[PDB]
Design a protein around this ligand. Structure first.
Ligand SMILES: [Zn+2]
Ligand SMILES: [Zn+2]
Ligand SMILES: [Zn+2]
Ligand SMILES: [Zn+2]
Lengths: 306, 307
């Protein structure tokens, strides 16, 4: 037989949301120890992982996703992956953006759910230049007043200090060209996009709601880190939630609303493309991923059946 | 904003199975009516579809998948898609095989789960030439004795005879160059592949079990058509099962075995890439799709070195 090709399909996936075009972008993966980075029983944890056929031991392989949304008026990127801040298994968001047929120069707006390295570090090329040189970076103010504050980094423990530095470094090239905007709760950023506060995981963690043609998409950030356990058991928390209790409360609220409104979700650490719906179950919730499809423009003729 | 790109990512997806390289190939989709093709209450049906966020009305959009497995000894393609036999929403298997980095000339074996047009028509190019010119086509004997038999075709319902013609046309160019091989329930065809009989959907319907490095993949064909209802209720039948009773039994058996032995499944009408596992639920079963991942060579090397 001939040589095995090996290479994986590129990490982009296209979906229509009304008139908006969504392109999910894969940053890569990180192996995360199931151990702690948790809040429940070891027997229950392994049982929940096994039923989703998720290997732990060597860690739970976890996706990192970003979302590119073309509304017609704006080309907006929601989160940016990790570049090389978390090692060589990540940082492929910009290459998947290009593979998907876009150019980073076309991005006019970057929305950050929060300033963790796996969301912000992709803002910057390896050589220090801004990855999206024409974009304005919108960061939640609470998120900015936390990670970008000098004393706060100093009164912080060593194992957390690097994340402060990476945040400062991710955002710096945009601050220097006056392209950094910390925003407050008021004023809806772009036509068709509104804010959904979801603090806890970080102090200003924010989810973004896109609406077009009667359809809704919540690009929710890090509401949840492990789909196999935290949908069934939302009470389970993550070691690196800055405030795990508040993060838990945001998740419980967002989970309930998403389930009852039946809106689309785009989740940064849900299996790529990270697009789908939340369904309420007997005890907790379940994740229902999109089924792979070309864009159904022909079906878009619900428009003539009005 | 610039113009929207609109185009979808190519329909191929790579997975490792032991030393084997699996490439799932998308053929496209077909909208199938939820009704008619079923065996339970309308209301219960819509409820099962709705809990998986599947729209019926305008019909259930259904994927058609084929599977390319590089065993090291062989490049074997399991099923081939529909070509243009079912219209322009299908027939993309070969272009996806090319996007995945292979060329159709490299395929030495084509395994067919059954001779339905969405599985066998991809065998022939638009010009009439064989799509896989160097390949031997392996078809289960019971499948050939049914679909390729003239008398059987003659006495068959008007609505079915098109499938008979399509089957014959699909297999014709390979039969001409003596590259058409009907095989019996016995004999193993290639190293690493075993037979799992699963008749019912058609009389010779056959599922293929690939085994490497302690891991197993069942390229199962059409034992199941709608993931949202037939995992949870496998007794629900499909209108085009030639023998629906027998199809139920094969489905029940195959699901039970897949769940207990934790086989990977490659499923022709499951949402692309159609790769994943079957889990036992309180009522019936559930489909657990593979998570998108590059091949973990590091993990595979580590496992081999440790023991
Ligand atoms: Zn985070
Ligand atoms: Zn994150
Ligand atoms: Zn069939
Ligand atoms: Zn079929």
């Amino acid at each position: 037989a001939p040589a095995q090709q090996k290479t994986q399909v590129p990490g982009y996936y296209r979906m229509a949301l009304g008139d908006f075009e969504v392109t999910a972008l894969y940053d890569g993966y990180v192996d995360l120890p199931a151990s702690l980075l948790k809040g429940i029983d070891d027997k229950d944890l392994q049982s929940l992982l096994a039923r989703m056929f998720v290997a732990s031991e060597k860690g739970v392989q976890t996706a990192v996703n970003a979302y590119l949304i073309n509304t017609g008026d704006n080309l907006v990127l929601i989160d940016t992956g990790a570049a090389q801040c978390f090692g060589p298994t990540l940082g492929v968001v910009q290459t998947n953006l290009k593979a998907s047929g876009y150019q980073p120069e076309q991005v006019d707006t970057v929305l950050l759910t929060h300033l963790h390295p796996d969301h912000a570090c992709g803002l910057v090329n390896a050589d220090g230049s801004p990855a999206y040189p024409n974009a304005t970076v919108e960061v939640p103010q609470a998120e900015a007043e936390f990670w970008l504050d000098e004393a706060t980094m100093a009164k912080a423990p060593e194992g957390m200090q690097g994340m402060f530095k990476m945040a400062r470094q991710a955002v710096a090239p945009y601050a220097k060209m006056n392209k950094l905007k910390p925003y407050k709760t008021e004023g809806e950023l772009l036509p068709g996009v509104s804010l959904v506060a979801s603090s806890g995981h970080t102090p200003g963690h924010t989810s973004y709601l896109f609406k077009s043609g009667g359809q809704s998409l919540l690009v929710w950030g890090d509401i949840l880190i492990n789909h196999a356990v935290q949908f069934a058991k939302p009470e389970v928390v993550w070691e690196f939630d800055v405030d795990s209790d508040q993060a838990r409360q945001s998740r419980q609220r967002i989970l309930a609303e998403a389930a009852t409104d039946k809106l689309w979700v785009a989740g940064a650490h849900l299996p790529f493309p990270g697009l789908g719906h939340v369904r309420e179950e007997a005890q907790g919730y379940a994740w229902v991923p999109v089924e792979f499809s070309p864009i159904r423009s022909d079906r878009k003729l619900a428009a003539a059946l009005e």
